[PDB]
Design a protein around this nucleic acid. Sequence first.
RNA 1: AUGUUU
RNA 2: AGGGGAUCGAAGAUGAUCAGAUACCGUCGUAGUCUUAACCAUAAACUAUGCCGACUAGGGAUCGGGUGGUGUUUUUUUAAUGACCCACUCGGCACCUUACGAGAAAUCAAAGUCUUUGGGUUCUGGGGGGAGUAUGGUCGCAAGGCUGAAACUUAAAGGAAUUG
Lengths: 96, 25, 121, 217, 97, 206, 87, 81, 129, 150
Amino acid sequence: GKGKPRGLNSARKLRVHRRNNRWAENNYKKRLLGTAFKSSPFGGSSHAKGIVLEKLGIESKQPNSAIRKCVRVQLIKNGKKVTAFVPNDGCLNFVD
Amino acid sequence: MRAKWRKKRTRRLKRKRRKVRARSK
Amino acid sequence: GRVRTKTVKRASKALIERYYPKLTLDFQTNKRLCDEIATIQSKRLRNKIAGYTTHLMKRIQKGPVRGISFKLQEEERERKDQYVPEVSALDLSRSNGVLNVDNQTSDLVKSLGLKLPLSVI
Amino acid sequence: GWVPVTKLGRLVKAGKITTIEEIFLHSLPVKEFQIIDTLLPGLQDEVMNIKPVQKQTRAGQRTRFKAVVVVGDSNGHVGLGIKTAKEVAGAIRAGIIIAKLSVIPIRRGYWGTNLGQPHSLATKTTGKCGSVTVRLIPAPRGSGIVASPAVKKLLQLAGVEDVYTQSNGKTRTLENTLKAAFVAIGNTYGFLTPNLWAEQPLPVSPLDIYSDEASAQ
Amino acid sequence: PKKRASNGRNKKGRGHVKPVRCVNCSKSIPKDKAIKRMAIRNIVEAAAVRDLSEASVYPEYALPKTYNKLHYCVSCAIHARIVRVRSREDRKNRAPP
Amino acid sequence: SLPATFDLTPEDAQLLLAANTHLGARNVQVHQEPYVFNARPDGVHVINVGKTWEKLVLAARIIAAIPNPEDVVAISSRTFGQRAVLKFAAHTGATPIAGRFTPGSFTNYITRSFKEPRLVIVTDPRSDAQAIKEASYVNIPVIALTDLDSPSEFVDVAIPCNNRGKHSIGLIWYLLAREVLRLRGALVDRTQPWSIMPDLYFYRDP
Amino acid sequence: MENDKGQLVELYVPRKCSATNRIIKADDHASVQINVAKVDEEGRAIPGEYVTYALSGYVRSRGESDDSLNRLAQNDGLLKNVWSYSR
Amino acid sequence: VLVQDLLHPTAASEARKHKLKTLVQGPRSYFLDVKCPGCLNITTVFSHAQTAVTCESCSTILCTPTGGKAKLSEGTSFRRK
Amino acid sequence: TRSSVLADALNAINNAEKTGKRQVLIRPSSKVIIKFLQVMQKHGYIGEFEYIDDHRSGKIVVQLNGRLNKCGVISPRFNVKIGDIEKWTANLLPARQFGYVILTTSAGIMDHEEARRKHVSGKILGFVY
Amino acid sequence: GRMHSAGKGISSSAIPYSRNAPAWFKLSSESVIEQIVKYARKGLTPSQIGVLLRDAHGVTQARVITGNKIMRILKSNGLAPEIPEDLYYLIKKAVSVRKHLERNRKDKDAKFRLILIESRIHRLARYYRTVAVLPPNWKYESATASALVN
RNA sequence: AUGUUU
RNA sequence: AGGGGAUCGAAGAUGAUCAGAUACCGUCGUAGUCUUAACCAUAAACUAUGCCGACUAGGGAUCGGGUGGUGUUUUUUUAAUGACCCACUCGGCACCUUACGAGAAAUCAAAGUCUUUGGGUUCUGGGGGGAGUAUGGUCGCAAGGCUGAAACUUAAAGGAAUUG
Ligand SMILES: [K+]
Ligand SMILES: [K+]
Ligand SMILES: [Mg+2]
Ligand SMILES: [Mg+2]
Ligand SMILES: [Mg+2]
Ligand SMILES: [Mg+2]
Ligand SMILES: [Mg+2]
Ligand SMILES: [Mg+2]
Ligand SMILES: [Mg+2]
Ligand SMILES: [Mg+2]
Ligand SMILES: [Mg+2]
Ligand SMILES: [Zn+2]
């Protein structure tokens, strides 16, 4: 055989084995554990408003250069502090 | 580092952690 | 050493391939013919070619040599027949007009042929 | 001119053999691309890709160029050539030659009923090269060639208009994917069907029919 | 990958083979893996067979041989050239020279 | 379908038995040879010379079917068969390959080689494996002089014969040439012994 | 393979092996077609008249073409006692 | 090969084959009539007898068991029933 | 241990055909095996087959004619409805014009064509093409 | 094969195709049945009864001569054992191994073999209880194994 | 016998 | 925990190398090595290949059993076992060649009979780390075993093979 039961009455074993092995999938495990709610400062949401706390220049990882002008933000929703990149040429002067 | 010595160092760390948790209560 | 390179050996073989009814096994009358039937651009190389051709055609009279066919191997092969002729085709002789076979060969012949002179021990 | 070698090629240039289907029927090995050129004049060629292959030797980068070519007429015949040469141009030309030499017939068939001019394959087929498995499934009319661009190009040069494709393995290895698709194409005329069950009288080879084509007077 | 079709040893159907000690360095090797060479040298080769036969009080003495089975580990056998590195195809050849 | 004239006669039967064609290989014999008559002690197997003769006749008919005699290639790298194939290609219009085969002789259409035959005959499939492989590369049928321990791969007509003996090899080649000539018409009547004796095909070492 | 109204729409109805009945493909360069000359009135090997056998590259590679040709010949004639069904 | 009569294998090959691997399985054992040193019966003895069979009306040992075929006491006549 | 004598028989037939043999012996040669062979022989994928009666379950010698590409069992013997016969044929057969999905129905063992023209269904047994 | 081993042995009897008595067999079915009952009263199990019948007499199979198996003959004549013979011999082997084990106590090989033997005993006893050859409450216990083989 | 690093 | 403790020898002590050398090397030497009575339950515990069943090449060796032979040698008195030889056979450790076939390849008679995908069945894996970590449970005298995450991080890590 193929290492899995083939018998006509093997449905319970087949589906239980699938249930056990689905936990090795990133997406399935994350969704069933509810990582986005407990972890993931955005509580499983697309966007989140927050209050800037500090301008910061983080030096881009090697082999690059040109520190990237992010902002520390404190989320109104839950209160966590996240670093958010400010994408454009300039565009830091428009955030205070 | 060698996997054997990584395991040994980790076991020593585990022993120290058990001892600290024992002294605490 | 005194080993001849490919531009000597191959040119000599090419000369002997088409000029066997030509220059003999003597170097003096070999190089002269080379002069008129080969565009050798140096007398030293001509001397090499003619000496190796002389050697090739001197040893040609002791047996055919590899990679050389001047349309005489076929002739000499078909000429040299029957080194042991008119004595025995290995038929009805070399015995008391019988075949000295074993029992199993005897049964083999008994399978189809009732006529075979046998001395099956 | 041509000045043929390959007495098969001699017969082709003499006009004794006038269809490549005879060569295919007698499984005659073709050694000159001119045989294919004269038997399939309407044979177009598509270069699939040129990629540099590199050999490291004493500062390395021998950097030869390898070209994949598919030749074919969109009626029954494709061939696939893969050739590496020092320059892209010469590799392409030699690959076209190799593909013409490798030209084989494909067996087109019907998905459903017998409405004329077969549009699809006669059976399911599979080819494998390396890790790449390409499976061709007969498709109804109007389905088109359901395949990735390279295999779809090879199939329309084969003359298939309706086919489903399935693939497994590292299909981003273009050479192996094309070779697997070419094997799948070729196996169609190797799959025995009930309509081919009937026994035929085993015709005589053209090489025997015209035997006075190996000589130099 | 797997370098040798069976292994660098001779053990199929056994599981465990008791070890031996290398004559040169004392490394423990399974007896089937150790490189074993027999030595049947003459007790007196010594450039001096004739001298010993002259000094001998017995005519036709038939001087004896010294017998010794040597067991080498892989490292010691390779280093002392009892055994040598062979090509990938030459390794698949078990006849002695 | 072949007449009693094509049946095996006592004359060539005792010719085979004298040449020791029937002395097959030892107990080691390829398990694809039903040409074996009962095995005598000392291991030597007896080859059924009736089957040998029938296969020789079938091979001769295959050779005669070939329209151009030059399209038939006789091959022997073993010395014991080189004179055999040379005399065979003299008597029939065949093309001989004696000695080295120069791998690439059936593919690789470059000069000094590249004959394109319709049939290949080999003295020993083992020693002529290269020619057999190339024939399998270019669709060439193969007849072979096969001992009971000779490989059968890509060998379409196996003539069972001892190939350890120069007498056997030469005699088998001689009978093959005889039957080819008889079928062609060179020998008008298959009742005369073909005056050319079966020693011109044998090997001569000195 | 014919279409509706029954005209042959497939090119190159292929040959089949005389031994194993498998199709001789266009690239099977190990396959072999053997012609055995016909014999009329004490020999003379009528030219162009043969008994034809097609052996597949598979059989030839397996080294069974000799036995298969023995069987097929003997079934057509051309051989009286070489091949036996029982073994 | 590739063509053989599986339904009619030769007697030689069938006798070569293991008893379970013939076309139809069957025993290669048999029964013998051993001449008793006395009378009133010719004793029937299995060829592969596991028992040290003695005469029905006496106490002489006719066969001694072995791994395969039994022995025959070194004086006896034995028909092969 | 042996769980499908039909699977063993069809596997032996497949191996013999793909090795080019013209005959194959199969043991223990049950009734389902014989019916499956009868279907295959009716459609001409095998030749004659002869049952050898040992007083065990028996044997069969089948004559192959080189027209068999593959015969196989579907294990387990899935329950198949009339509308699932088409899915099984699509999955197993090389084309829609030839080959057979063989079923066991209470109208007997039969290929899918005569199954659907008797309007019967059952459990899937195997396939042949 | 070899339920409790890696052995793949196939050695067994190959009983003939002929389902009738051999032509050279002239003893009555009643006479062989009487011999069977005599051996059973002498205390032989059906297996050794068959062995004696085949070795010392010409009865190839009691089932082909008398048309009945030896155990069935013994049961019809009231000479059947209280437990089947194979189960009895398995329990006897278990008792022997267990006695050796309580005398050695370091023979871990014997401990393992005893586990195997008792596994076989329990499987065979489950079969016999299923087919109602043994009472539904029949139980094999280590300390009464001797008590039930004697 | 010893001979580190890039 | 008793007994035993020759040898070798985690620790430890020393000699020497060395830039350092609390390493390799030398000399000792405790535990241990051995045994009894109990624990422990882990190994590259490996064939890194679950088990049961069937089929698909060829070959010669070899172990155990069996069968046969005009067999050789061996003696007891016919004959006999024994050893050997030959052939066959069942079972086993393997091996050689070729691969229809398989595989990414190395290679593989199974790692084949797989996109022409289903004989039965158990266990395991789902990119690399974090991590066999934390925590809880359980077993253990302990060492530890079994079970076993997450946060976070990362575009490779890895396999086989090629030329340098
Ligand atoms: K950069
Ligand atoms: K001590
Ligand atoms: Mg390595
Ligand atoms: Mg171990
Ligand atoms: Mg079994
Ligand atoms: Mg079990
Ligand atoms: Mg650096
Ligand atoms: Mg573990
Ligand atoms: Mg493991
Ligand atoms: Mg992972
Ligand atoms: Mg690597
Ligand atoms: Zn060492």
